[PDB]
Design a protein around this ligand. Structure first.
Ligand SMILES: NC(=O)c1ccc[n+]([C@@H]2O[C@H](COP(=O)([O-])OP(=O)(O)OC[C@H]3O[C@@H](n4cnc5c(N)ncnc54)[C@H](O)[C@@H]3O)[C@@H](O)[C@H]2O)c1
Ligand SMILES: NC(=O)c1ccc[n+]([C@@H]2O[C@H](COP(=O)([O-])OP(=O)(O)OC[C@H]3O[C@@H](n4cnc5c(N)ncnc54)[C@H](O)[C@@H]3O)[C@@H](O)[C@H]2O)c1
Ligand SMILES: NC(=O)c1ccc[n+]([C@@H]2O[C@H](COP(=O)([O-])OP(=O)(O)OC[C@H]3O[C@@H](n4cnc5c(N)ncnc54)[C@H](O)[C@@H]3O)[C@@H](O)[C@H]2O)c1
Ligand SMILES: NC(=O)c1ccc[n+]([C@@H]2O[C@H](COP(=O)([O-])OP(=O)(O)OC[C@H]3O[C@@H](n4cnc5c(N)ncnc54)[C@H](O)[C@@H]3O)[C@@H](O)[C@H]2O)c1
Ligand code: NA
Ligand code: NA
Ligand code: NA
Ligand code: NA
Lengths: 241, 241, 241, 241
């Protein structure tokens, strides 16, 4: 049926997204840097193809898409999911390392969209970007991650406006998703549980099926970002170390 | 097997929401001010119950919930959908009429949530509020509608933080939904079509089934609000009369 | 040389706003429900006029504007500041009391803007609404306050789009402003202090002097709403009781 | 008094910011790629120092800050203003060119903040980032610009959270600022005029003086982004070419 490409499909959120599309009857090709885990994931699942590589490398991206077109023969959906968090200004994270985070989290989604532009337009496809609530609020020392995620939230509406009406483009901003808890861990989140990869993949598949939502970023974080918190009020306390 | 209550269920978005829950196998009780249309809607649909009334009147809201509990015996989902458009400051909309808009669009959602509080908590239920993209951008002379819609967007995260983790509460902000077009009408929307009630009801039922989204407002407007528009650029033109 | 009207001008933020305009050389007329405090405030300040009344009552609003036009002879600036905190769904806040909060925080700003419409247009004036960060995030049991504040944020862009280019209309959303602290109280706020009325009045007078900002809401909360908080991380802890 | 560094200070917004700080009695060092214009700007203004260079180059950034410390002897304010727009996915903008835009608009602000971190903390300074309303809405073919601007909006709250309470960090998102008009050009903007560099520099200096605003992005666009626009309504028309 559909040809689907996923970045970072070897584990966590990306893995569950791959499974969901497989279950929906589609063929899936994913890129990931973790060779062993990804190869196991693809083993004995004929409709799941793995490409070993780093999305930070533009040359690797083109080879990936070429490989995907060979295995899928069509691209209907691009899921931009790859990313690894890091530190920031308090750690004095170096320029080159800040850059690498942008390469993985921001340049890759653009370049993949660019490589797949004509195919997605022809197939009237979908692009789904995975961001984070870190695009909107910050903990200290999160500069690189925030920059990449802020960037991808904006890239989402840019792509939506460039590629509409043929391609619809949306973004999901997850909160705490368990990809590996005390009663405080769970109670502190308004929805009262820690998120799961399925919470994200459900929204991915749903968004891909709609045709009147584009350019939007949807927050899936159990309500954490909506919780107003002041020290000493409603169960929350700041502790000076 | 859910008991579902919907406001403004006699037509348009509310009507489609009612049908979707019915199709899902739930029982639905809806209130609406348009009696003839609403009675026809309910006729020969045993699991669909109609209550005639104006949600602006608090007494009617209490009687409505009492009726619903009698017909449904349980309330699992509350959908706040009822609202009517209005004018504003340029029409010099009277105080009492501004108030009326607030009664329908803001007070009712709160009062219904309050009346159903214990029932929803007990049943681990859901609340879905229908707002509008008019909460975030305005045309001239829209003060009443904007105030009610802005209010309901905030009421959503307020209710979410009060009732979590037992009840999850979300909001959908529709753009242009045809509840009744030129080539320009459709082309001007990035998604390239005018919206339909099904676009909204799909999101309503999806949100009710999730358990890691709460307090959020999701924009469903074909990308219209994400489109940057300046006169003379990219096909848009301002015309002085 | 401006005629300025302020609601809730007898204390706290409103009071400081009044003083700032007086210092700027303007004449100020303010309404407030606290008579003794407000009379003292006005005493022996010839350019400061006090009108006793509850902004919840539409008749009082009209009489208030009439008084102001008699004392000021012209209205250049309207500052909607009056509001009182409340409870919500967990306290089962009654319908009539929820309504009252809306009367003070949402209906009054609209009605005052409506009463002053022609005067403000003629004078190329300004409207400044005081909201709260509670428009965007919630603590439990805050439904009434959230609804009014969310409403006023939207009312702001509605009024801006109706009255532009003649009248510019903006909103300030304060965080914690001391209108009356532990080491933790101050350290928990990223800016490292509790806010003061002057922090708000500075922005009020600044916004009135600009001519390229309209419809916006500016957050003045020492960065509190931008702080991502998860239990156990970066000095924050959730405590179950 | 204060030591101020500005990127892109040779023309437009950056130039006006430099002038404003000079007028305030501070010493200003600015980097710019346009040598002739920048040298003229600095000519015979003893407190204004020009450094020729491209902010895209990390080595140039370090030399710039070293030069600035030599001329100013202290850094109290960092204004991240440099940026040049480009195209995007419809032009199939190449990876390397997308990257360059990120280097100028996103990497530079981070690296400069990083280089000046200790100095700004010691001096309890300020960082002001210049973004754009393009961070929040898009015209077609704007991917690179959107990505950089979205990134810098998020970088702003990240820096604010990392460096508070010692350094406050804010962002201004300009709309149409004339740095070089028909009656439609002006009437189409709700505030009824095109923006000027002074509209931005006023906000820069104001923000630098506040101490209870941090992590915030302020929109200065004459209300354009708040205007709801649908084809055929309220003077706006989409034309299919
Ligand atoms: N997990 C969370 O709490 C959370 C929160 C917010 C956002 N996110 C976002 O979710 C997405 C997936 O993250 P996750 O939580 O599943 O992380 P994860 O580590 O569990 O999985 C990410 C996958 O991507 C792969 N990967 C990383 N860098 C790569 C590269 N350069 N080239 C190719 N493959 C690479 C990894 O091998 C891994 O399999 C990311 O974009 C992340 O920013 C996650
Ligand atoms: N249609 C759109 O383009 C659009 C856009 C944004 C938001 N919305 C929102 O969608 C919701 C549904 O509106 P719609 O577009 O379907 O309108 P609609 O006219 O098609 O239906 C609204 C229904 O509510 C009923 N109703 C109105 N006022 C009532 C009251 N006071 N008490 C009881 N019933 C009442 C009407 O009789 C009608 O059956 C509203 O909340 C509206 O604000 C719609
Ligand atoms: N103080 C904060 O931390 C904070 C935070 C967010 C928003 N705000 C907003 O700031 C504004 C001012 O509040 P404040 O903090 O200065 O409170 P405050 O108690 O210090 O002063 C409010 C003033 O308004 C008057 N008032 C209240 N209700 C009135 C009514 N119905 N009619 C006429 N006058 C009335 C009171 O007598 C008082 O003088 C309010 O709109 C409030 O919502 C304050
Ligand atoms: N002008 C607008 O309508 C508008 C709208 C939104 C955002 N902005 C933002 O305002 C800021 C300033 O833009 P402007 O409108 O003044 O543009 P401008 O072209 O008038 O001036 C930008 C200055 O930066 C310099 N510059 C560009 N690239 C550089 C580099 N790589 N290294 C060193 N110097 C460099 C240029 O020589 C120029 O003097 C930018 O960040 C831009 O994104 C402007
Ligand atoms: Na396989
Ligand atoms: Na029936
Ligand atoms: Na007096
Ligand atoms: Na000089």
């Amino acid at each position: 049926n559909r040809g689907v490409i996923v970045t970072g499909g070897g584990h966590g959120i990306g893995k569950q997204i791959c499974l969901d599309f497989l279950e929906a009857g589609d063929k899936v090709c994913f890129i990931d840097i973790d060779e062993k885990r990804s190869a196991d994931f693809a083993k004995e699942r004929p409709n799941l193809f793995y490409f070993h590589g780093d999305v930070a490398d533009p040359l690797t991206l083109k080879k990936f898409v070429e490989y995907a077109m060979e295995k899928l023969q069509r691209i209907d959906v691009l899921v931009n999911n790859a990313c690894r968090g890091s530190k920031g200004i308090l750690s004095s994270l170096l320029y080159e390392e800040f850059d690498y985070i942008l390469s993985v989290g921001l340049k890759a989604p653009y370049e993949l969209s660019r490589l797949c532009r004509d195919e997605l337009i022809k197939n009237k496809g979908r692009i789904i970007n995975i961001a984070s609530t870190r695009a909107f609020q910050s903990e200290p020392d999160s500069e690189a991650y925030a920059s990449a995620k802020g960037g991808i939230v904006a890239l989402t509406h840019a792509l939506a406006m460039s590629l509409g009406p043929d391609v619809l483009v949306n973004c999901i901003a997850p909160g705490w998703i368990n990809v590996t808890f005390t009663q405080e861990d769970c109670a502190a989140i308004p929805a009262g549980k820690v998120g799961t990869p399925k919470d994200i993949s459900n929204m991915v598949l749903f968004l891909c099926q709609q045709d009147f939502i584009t350019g939007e970023t949807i927050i899936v974080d159990g309500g954490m970002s909506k919780r107003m918190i002041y020290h000493g009020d409603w169960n929350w306390f700041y502790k000076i170390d």
